[PDB]
Amino acid sequence: IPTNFSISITTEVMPVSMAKTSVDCNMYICGDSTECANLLLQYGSFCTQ
Amino acid sequence: PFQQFGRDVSDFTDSVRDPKTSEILDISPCAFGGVSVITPGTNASSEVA
Numbered sequence: 645i646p647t648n649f650s651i652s653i654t655t656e657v658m659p660v661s662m663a664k665t666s667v668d669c670n671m672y673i674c675g676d677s678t679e680c681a682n683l684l685l686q687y688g689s690f691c692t693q
Numbered sequence: 694p695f696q697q698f699g700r701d702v703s704d705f706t707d708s709v710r711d712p713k714t715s716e717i718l719d720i721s722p723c724a725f726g727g728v729s730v731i732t733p734g735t736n737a738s739s740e741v742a
Contacts, residue, residue, distance in 0.1 A: 671725055
């Protein structure tokens with residue numbers, strides 16, 4: 645049977661959020677080539693999905 | 694004095710001395726992004742932001 649107590653305080657770290665990233669495929673795909681967009685629009689909604 | 698142009702960590706052109714004179718800086722990236730549409734609801738009104 646214990647006779648004395650010991651009040652302790654522990655810590656616990658848990659992530660709840662991350663980096664809200666947003667990549668624009670208009671600049672990533674077809675950076676500056678104006679003729680590149682004509683072929684990029686041929687694929688479809690890969691920049692929308 | 695020997696470096697004319699300079700890249701960034703992402704390997705993109707960031708600044709370069711003026712090749713003629715004045716020894717000045719150079720372009721900066723333009724503005725872009727994903728434009729979103731805010732609508733309070735077509736049943737209530739037809740506003741848009």
